[PDB]
Amino acid sequence: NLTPLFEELLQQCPPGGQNKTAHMVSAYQLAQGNWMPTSCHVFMGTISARRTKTHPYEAYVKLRELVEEHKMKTLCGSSLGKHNDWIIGKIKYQGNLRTKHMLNPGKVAEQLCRHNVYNKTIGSVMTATGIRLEKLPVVRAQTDTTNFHQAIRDKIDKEENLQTPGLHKKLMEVFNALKRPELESSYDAVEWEELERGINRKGAAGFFERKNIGEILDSEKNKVEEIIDNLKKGRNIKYYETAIPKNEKRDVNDDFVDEKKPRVIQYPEAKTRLAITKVMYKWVKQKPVVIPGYEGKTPLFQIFDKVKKEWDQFQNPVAVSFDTKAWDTQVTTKDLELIKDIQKYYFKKKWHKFIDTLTMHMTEVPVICADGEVYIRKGQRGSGQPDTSAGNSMLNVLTMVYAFCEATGVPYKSFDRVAKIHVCGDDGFLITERALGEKFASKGVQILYEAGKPQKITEGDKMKVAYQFDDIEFCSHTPIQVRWSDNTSSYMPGRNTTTILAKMATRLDSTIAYEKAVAFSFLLMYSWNPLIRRICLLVLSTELQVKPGTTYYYEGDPISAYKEVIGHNLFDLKRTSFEKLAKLNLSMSVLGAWTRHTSKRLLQDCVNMGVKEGNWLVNADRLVSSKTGNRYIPGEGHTLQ
Numbered sequence: 001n002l003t004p005l006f007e008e009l010l011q012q013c014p015p016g017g018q019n020k021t022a023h024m025v026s027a028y029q030l031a032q033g034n035w036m037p038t039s040c041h042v043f044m045g046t047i048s049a050r051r052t053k054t055h056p057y058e059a060y061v062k063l064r065e066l067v068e069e070h071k072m073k074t075l076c077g078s079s080l081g082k083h084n085d086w087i088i089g090k091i092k093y094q095g096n097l098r099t100k101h102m103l104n105p106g107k108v109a110e111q112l113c114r115h116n117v118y119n120k121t122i123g124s125v126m127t128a129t130g131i132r133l134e135k136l137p138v139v140r141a142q143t144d145t146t147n148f149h150q151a152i153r154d155k156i157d158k159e160e161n162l163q164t165p166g167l168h169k170k171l172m173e174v175f176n177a178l179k180r181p182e183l184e185s186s187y188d189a190v191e192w193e194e195l196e197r198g199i200n201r202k203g204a205a206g207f208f209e210r211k212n213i214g215e216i217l218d219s220e221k222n223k224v225e226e227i228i229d230n231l232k233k234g235r236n237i238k239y240y241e242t243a244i245p246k247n248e249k250r251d252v253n254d255d256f257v258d259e260k261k262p263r264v265i266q267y268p269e270a271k272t273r274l275a276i277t278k279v280m281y282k283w284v285k286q287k288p289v290v291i292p293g294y295e296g297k298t299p300l301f302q303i304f305d306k307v308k309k310e311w312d313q314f315q316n317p318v319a320v321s322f323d324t325k326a327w328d329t330q331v332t333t334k335d336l337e338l339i340k341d342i343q344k345y346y347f348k349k350k351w352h353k354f355i356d357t358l359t360m361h362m363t364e365v366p367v368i369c370a371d372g373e374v375y376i377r378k379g380q381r382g383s384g385q386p387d388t389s390a391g392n393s394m395l396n397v398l399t400m401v402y403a404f405c406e407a408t409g410v411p412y413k414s415f416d417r418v419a420k421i422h423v424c425g426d427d428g429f430l431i432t433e434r435a436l437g438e439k440f441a442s443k444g445v446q447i448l449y450e451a452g453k454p455q456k457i458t459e460g461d462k463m464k465v466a467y468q469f470d471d472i473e474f475c476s477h478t479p480i481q482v483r484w485s486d487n488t489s490s491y492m493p494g495r496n497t498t499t500i501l502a503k504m505a506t507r508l509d510s511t512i513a514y515e516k517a518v519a520f521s522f523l524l525m526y527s528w529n530p531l532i533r534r535i536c537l538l539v540l541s542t543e544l545q546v547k548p549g550t551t552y553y554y555e556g557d558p559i560s561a562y563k564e565v566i567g568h569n570l571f572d573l574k575r576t577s578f579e580k581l582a583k584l585n586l587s588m589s590v591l592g593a594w595t596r597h598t599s600k601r602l603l604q605d606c607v608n609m610g611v612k613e614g615n616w617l618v619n620a621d622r623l624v625s626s627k628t629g630n631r632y633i634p635g636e637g638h639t640l641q
Helices: 003-010 027-030 057-074 120-128 145-156 167-178 192-197 213-219 223-233 268-284 300-311 334-345 350-362 390-409 412-417 435-450 498-505 513-528 530-540 557-565 578-590 598-611 620-627
Strands: 024-026 048-051 089-093 106-108 115-118 243-244 264-268 317-322 364-369 373-378 419-424 426-434 478-484 489-494 506-509 553-556 571-578 637-640
Touching: 003 027, 003 057, 003 373, 024 027, 024 145, 027 048, 027 057, 027 598, 089 300, 089 334, 089 498, 089 637, 115 598, 120 498, 120 513, 120 530, 145 264, 145 373, 167 334, 167 390, 167 412, 213 223, 213 268, 213 620, 223 350, 243 506, 264 268, 268 334, 268 350, 268 390, 300 426, 300 478, 300 513, 317 435, 334 598, 350 364, 350 620, 390 419, 390 426, 390 435, 426 435, 478 578, 489 513, 489 598, 498 513, 513 530, 513 553, 513 557, 513 637, 530 598, 553 557, 557 637, 571 578, 578 620
Parallel strands: 243 364
Antiparallel strands: 024 048, 089 106, 106 373, 115 506, 243 264, 317 426, 364 373, 419 426, 478 489, 478 571, 553 637
């Protein structure tokens, strides 16, 4: 009766270990009365209790008393580490972050250095069909300095999560169930050439740097090699991260979902990022993949077909979603230490002192904000570290297998026999049989809280379950089935039409070639969406002399290029799933972004252009060509990046 009240309190208790000595009672037994909490330390949703016949509300006031007693004797003195001392010398002005859990030593001197504009061609195409641009959500919000420091105080300014005693030994036992011993002690640094192939030269400079990635490559390689040398020998470097709001000028990726970035971007200097990537390439880029389920290298237009083939081998498949609240701030020092031990498993012994020193620097990180304010972060992850994707994915896989096995009784070495997991940093889900998944979905919240990865406050304290394939959510997307004219069916990455329109029509800048790279990219993703697909085809049909400039672009003909990645011709897309299309279209009607005329004014504009003589891309749309009589004859075309 009082059970859900206790379930909520137990997610405020400090995690503890087993007891045996004392009777260990759950939130159920507590609300049944006649149990008195001896301690507030929780182990698997149990607490210790003396059978002294209490009132259920006396028990609750007791446990709550024990917890608040604990919380005030625990919020207490962070001595700065010698290797971070150098940042104090650069301090010039008093701090004003008002942080309650990490040092704010002050503010350094300001240093010597983008708004949301429309893509005019793409935007005018939408305006031309009655899509009302003013009703579309804002998709690239820039935070001002005051809400930025608020985001720091709100999300970063925290003490490290308590975790179950012995957790990381258990996680290490999960790792040993899925290591790849044929790769142990084999990873070595890579050559400049391999590094330079896969690296964005626009990659951002840190607070004290001036040159970006490409400029350091061109003229300051010796500075990167010196950092490698220091770390390799175990000497300290002047390691620091810079903090910027999401969608700031320096918010640039070194390598369609961009919602997978936190509000505060924290990133090491470009010299330092190159140093880490040169040595740890094979691990941070996952070449080869050793993280089970890792999908960070699978294209979004492929991922759901791959998952479908696994869903299809279960009697009663369900998927349980991982939804950790602000994952990067929940990463603890013991978590980083676990990743370090795993890296050292795969790396040759000559890089172990490198790995150790890097990790030490990452456990207490000086962070400089854009405005110069300094804070000292304990643990956590900066979203811009080269290890973010690989470290987070591995950490997520271990913690989720741990939680599932503790929850269901399945032993770690038996996970691969009853469940399939997929991860992209903190994002992911596992597929398994309905009984197993429902048992994991109810208990996972409390176990994952005690493992130091609290889940987003869900409905009834259960994790989200998908009972049908296309209710799965992953990388901001969800499966939508399409029908091909060869009588096959496949799945594409679905997402709300309102969100696709806003992403397509807007840009941060400080050219039609870029708009056609966007249109081709969105065509690769969203050709299941008749409205997106037709706008793409029109924009691509604009100024055909101009080559395209941006996750993907096409050499030669975009329609051929499409046929290469997707494996069908655009013209063979017969049908999109009726129900899932209606779901993904609802916010068009809720926001008033379209009207009853919009779908036909768009089709008409395509027919109007496609009946004309020539070779028109719009005629690659099955239904447009149906009404023009003309077809599109492709040239020779290839997808690149």
